[PDB]
Amino acid sequence: AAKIRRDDEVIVLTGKDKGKRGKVKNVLSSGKVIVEGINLVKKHQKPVPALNQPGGIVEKEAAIQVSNVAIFNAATGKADRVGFRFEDGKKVRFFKSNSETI
Amino acid sequence: PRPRPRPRPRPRPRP
Amino acid sequence: MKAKELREKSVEELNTELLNLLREQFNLRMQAASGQLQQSHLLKQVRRDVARVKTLLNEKAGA
Amino acid sequence: MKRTFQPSVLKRNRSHGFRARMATKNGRQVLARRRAKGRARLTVSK
Amino acid sequence: SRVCQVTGKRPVTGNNRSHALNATKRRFLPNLHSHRFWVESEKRFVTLRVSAKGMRVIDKKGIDTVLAELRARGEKY
Amino acid sequence: MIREERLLKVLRAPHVSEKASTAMEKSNTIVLKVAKDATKAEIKAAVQKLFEVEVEVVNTLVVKGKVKRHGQRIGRRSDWKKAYVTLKEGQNL
RNA sequence: UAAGGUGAUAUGAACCGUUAUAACCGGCGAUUUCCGAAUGGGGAAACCCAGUGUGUUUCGACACACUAUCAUUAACUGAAUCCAUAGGUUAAUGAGGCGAACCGGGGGAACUGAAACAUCUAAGUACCCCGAGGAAAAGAAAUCAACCGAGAUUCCCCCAGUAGCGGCGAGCGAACGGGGAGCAGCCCAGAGCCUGAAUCAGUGUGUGUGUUAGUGGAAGCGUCUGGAAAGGCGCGCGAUACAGGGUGACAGCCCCGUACACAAAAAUGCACAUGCUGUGAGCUCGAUGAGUAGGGCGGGACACGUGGUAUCCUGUCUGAAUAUGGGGGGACCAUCCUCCAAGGCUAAAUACUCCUGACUGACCGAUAGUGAACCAGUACCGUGAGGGAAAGGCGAAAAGAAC
RNA sequence: AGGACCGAACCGACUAAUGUCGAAAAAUUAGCGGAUGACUUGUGGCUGGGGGUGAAAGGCCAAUCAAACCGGGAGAUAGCU
RNA sequence: CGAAGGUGUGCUGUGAGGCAUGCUGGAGGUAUCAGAAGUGCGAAUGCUGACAUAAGUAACGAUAAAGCGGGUGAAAAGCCCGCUCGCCGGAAGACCAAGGGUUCCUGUCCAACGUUAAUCGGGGCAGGGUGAGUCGACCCCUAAGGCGAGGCCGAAAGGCGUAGUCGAUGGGAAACAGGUUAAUAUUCCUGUACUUGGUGUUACUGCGAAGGGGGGACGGAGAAGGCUAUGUUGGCCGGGCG
RNA sequence: UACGGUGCUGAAGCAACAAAUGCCCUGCUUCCAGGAAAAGCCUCUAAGCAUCAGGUAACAUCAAAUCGUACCCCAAACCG
């Protein structure tokens, strides 16, 4: 039922990183995906007294909405929408606009 | 917020 | 472990859940209170499987 | 001076306690009003 | 309460109208009495709190007949 | 029977404190949290079997939960009962 | 259904999974501490004390079940006197209590108006109590009408603020009839012939259909500005789908969705068909509701306040006829008309919304809107009944400020 | 012996001052009356709103009494402001 | 390439008002013509919230009273310790009952509380502490009184009341001394004891009621005697001779 | 001695007098106003059972459950 799953190579459609690519690390329950190399936030992390002293300004990956990204087709070289079909006994995702099987 | 004891009344007269 | 305890004999699986309480269920409760139990997911699953046998214990005995 | 409220748990429960309220028809209707209003503290009890 | 056994007469409310038509809420009471009637069936006496008009229902009927309706209504005669 | 099953639920946590540690070396008494609805016979029989030690007498008291405050919420700790289980000369744990 | 999850404040730790016994959703089951009708007894609620019968490692001492009241029925006993009853014991079934409004019944004010106030009105209103259902009540004429006729009850609009009632003051206020919704009639007071024939009720099966999980579900880019574009411009597509929401500013083609087309292992709602059981058909001849109608005294309700007052009900005292008889047709008499009491059941149109699902608003936008948009009947006040607040917004994303 | 006397605890409040937005929504200070009885007090009960209770002031009935408090008729009514 | 709102300016109409625009603000507003008002506040000793005023004024809450040195700390009149002064002492001391509910004790902090400061506290956070056969509660019983199977009465609700059942402020069984914790101690430890039940063994023996009887079981006041708690003195012991 | 306190050791430890509202005393006297109830405890038997069951004496053994227990308690902790 999820149009974008865990290990899908996606492309950002809207935001400051429009046109960049990258695979998703994880997706949250609030419709937020986490893709590396896209939402680089300069978090001023305080060094916890507990057993490690990172300090510095860390470079994390902020969450972005799943609606602003779409899975990369890697054949047409552009953004591609995804539907659902019943090609085998289970439900599987299939492409649109020169539809293929994922 | 409480009221006040009210001014002490004088002895009332008659005809 | 829904099927791995289903067809076992009544007092046979009764001994297991009576052993369940004799072990971890009581042993890990002593170790977690003394700050020696590193893992915390073990206490949750042991409470779950004790409830699993007691559900099957009532299912096998009588109705 | 002697204040009008001299507390006593025994006299409090004997007058406005739960079992005192349930001992009469009208006291039961008090609880119905409290439950309709959804008040947490129903009577004076422990 | 003031309830007749046979007829079922109970007190009713009304107005105590005066000469100036002042309405005062009063209560009409039945003429109940505790009379023990002889029953030839059981050869004993059965005491009842019946009305004076209720006894007039009793004597025109049978004493064993009127107790059947009391037994049917679920009354302890 | 299920008497031994009850003893496996009476014991809750081995209590430790400055007073409880002194009870070990001097008074030979273990201090440990028990069930709220636990009697002296139930506590004694649990330590007899589950700990393989000789229980002389068990003294219990109910600890009242302190009324704490998590910010603006008025909370209250759960009440619990501690046991002063005195062992004999041949104690192990 | 599923590649993500171990509810939230609220991270973290330790883990469970990745096409299947992770999690989630629903159906069916199990568990369901104590109080509370509480129901073993008691009691200051979440407490104390038991009794009986069974099953059991140290007589140690535990485990389970039962034991409340009342009503009905059955069985066994059983006085004061023989019998017998009252009473007692046991067994079975039902009830007890809670719940917003609607309904029926039993009680029932005053403030107010009359410019006072007692008749009256307010008002059979507020309130108290009892009872029942999903609707409740009533309900198939001893009815209306007029000497033409209509034919159960219930609800809406006229009739009509009319006729009337009323310190004829204030005020109260019809009926007849008509137009509509919805229309369903039956059983006993009794015997025979025929007996299960319509009829409903209780349980199974079959089919249809709905609910409780859900599935598929269309269609776009470039470029400009802008932090970010859905916004401007340009050129396309879908549309039984621009209902709606979210997406870094206003998106039909980014997503959730929507129209439309589908789906139920299991549990049921409803509609019939049908199996079984109970139930009672149809015809003939009868019967056809007594301390009742009515009357006297005193009230109540009918718009009708006793007035010339018809009608019904009732506290008390009386009291017929009985279908060749009686009631009503508004004091009452005679004639005609009509109906049949003193025994009962009944769906529909009718009222309400504690609660659930969907949708809408020339309703509010935080002193408003429910008292409460923020863990509100909460904090707080009062012994108690009860009263009762204030308190919304950083940012797109915490990236919430390393040093 | 004493509803005896003086006088502590205790009960009460006669005089004066202070206090009158007070330390206190009747108290303190200095004196006062009873102080073995019709005394005082603790605890647990009973009597309630046209009612209770009153060695009786129309006093008390939870700091409110010629008819307590709360909720409801009720947005009573007001020729008045 | 900047809506509404806010805040200024310049014009404009007889007027309620209108237009343009500087700045902030940040995403909504709305021409013209019609329609519907929760449609225009200075007053109601109007309601809610905020801020002035008197004014840095009274007061800082019994006239029992503080003075000094050292310590801690950024800061000491108020905290800690030591040396002097004063107050209560039939209490302003030490135990309880009722009533409160962790205020107890330790570590740590001075944002809010304390009518001043505060490293201080009954203030915030965290941790610990409440040990019973002999104390009390529970339990046996009962007074006043409550409920009340049946029963009587009452329109309903319900009222009274028997058996019974509750109901202490009363009657019933039993432990003292010493020591110990930062906080518990007739409860913990040591010493020495006491009471009530169950079971088993032995030896005798008739036991046995919601029943009878005894006892429990009782008023005020007064006086005397013997005592004791306790106090004083002497003796004894230890220290001293300033 | 972390200087808070801890460990060890430890003499005398008697007599006389005074003396209570406290004890004997729920006593005695006196007075009138005439001064709770039931349970525990002792005893007796009824219905019943007697080789029993039960009761008394001695010994051994077990058990005495549950809850309250900190602190203020004439007060900055209760009511105001």
Could you list the residue range(s) of the whole structural domain that residue A63 is in? 1-102
| HSE (side-chain half, CA atoms, 13 Å) at F35 | 15
* CA E54/CA E48 separation, integer angstroms: 10
Which is it for the CA torsion D36, D37, D42, D44, positive or negative? negative
Instruction: Resolution in Å, one decimal, please.
Output: 2.9
At E10, give phi and psi (nearest 5°): -125, 160
Chains touching B by CB (3 or more pairs below 8 Å) = none
Q: What CATH number is given to the structural domain containing D19? A: 1.10.287.3980
C-alpha angle F91/F92/F93, rounded to 5°?
Answer: 105
Task: Report the SS3 class of residue E32.
Answer: strand
* CA F16/CA C34 separation, integer angstroms: 9
**Minimal Cβ distance to C21: which of F5, F14, F16:** F5
* CA A82/CA E46 separation, integer angstroms: 94
| HSE (side-chain half, CA atoms, 13 Å) at C51 | 6
Determine the distance between F47 (CA) and G314 (C1') in angstroms: 83
C contacts of F9 (beta carbons < 8 Å): 21, 26
Residue type, F7: L
Q: Which residue ranges form the domains of chain E, and what is each CATH number?
A: 1-77 (2.30.170.40)
* A15 burial type by CB count under 10 A (0-12 exposed, 13-18 middle, 19+ buried): middle
Q: Do F8 and C26 touch (CB under 8 A)?
A: yes
| Secondary structure element (H or E) that encloses residue F51, with its range | none
Residues 6+ apart with CB under 8 A from D13: D19, D20, D44, D45
Q: Do F8 and C33 touch (CB under 8 A)?
A: no
* CA C51/CA A48 separation, integer angstroms: 40
Q: What is the DSSP letter of D13?
A: H
Maximum CA pair distance of chain D? Answer: 40
C-alpha angle F11/C22/F84, rounded to 5°?
Answer: 20
Determine the distance between D9 (CA) and H3 (C1') in angstroms: 40
Determine the nucleotide nearest to A53 by Cα–C1' distance.
G402
Q: How many CB atoms lie within 10 A of CB D6?
A: 7
* CA D26/CA D32 separation, integer angstroms: 10
* CA F93/CA F84 separation, integer angstroms: 14
CATH topology of domain F1-93: Alpha-Beta Plaits (3.30.70)
> Which of the residues C29, C43, C53 would you substitute to probe the F interface, choosing the one with the greatest number of F C-beta atoms within 10 Å?
C29
Total domains in the fold of chain A: 1
Determine the distance between E69 (CA) and G139 (C1') in angstroms: 28
* CA F33/CA F62 separation, integer angstroms: 10
Residue B6 gets the label, from left (phi > 0), alpha (psi -120 to 50) or beta, of: left
**Minimal Cβ distance to F5: which of C18, C30, C34:** C18
* CA D26/CA A39 separation, integer angstroms: 68
Alpha helices in chain C (DSSP H): 10-22, 24-33, 41-60
Determine the distance between E50 (CA) and G49 (C1') in angstroms: 49
F80-87 β-sheet, strand order: F11-13, F29-34, F80-87, F55-63
* CA D20/CA D17 separation, integer angstroms: 5
* A44-74 burial code (b ≥16 CB/10 A, e <16): eeeeeeeeeeeeeeeeebebbebeebbbbbe
Of F40, F10, F45, F33, the residue nearest F82 (C-alpha): F33
* CA A57/CA E14 separation, integer angstroms: 94
Residues of C with CB under 8 A from a CB of F: 18, 21-22, 25-26, 29-30, 33-34
Could you list the residue range(s) of the whole structural domain that residue D1 is in? 1-46
Strands A92-95 and E12-15: unpaired
Experimental method: cryo-EM
Total domains in the fold of chain D: 1
List the domain boundaries for chain F.
Answer: 1-93
| Secondary structure element (H or E) that encloses residue E55, with its range | helix E52-60
| HSE (side-chain half, CA atoms, 13 Å) at C20 | 18
> Which of the residues C21, C25, C37, C53 would you substitute to probe the F interface, choosing the one with the greatest number of F C-beta atoms within 10 Å?
C21
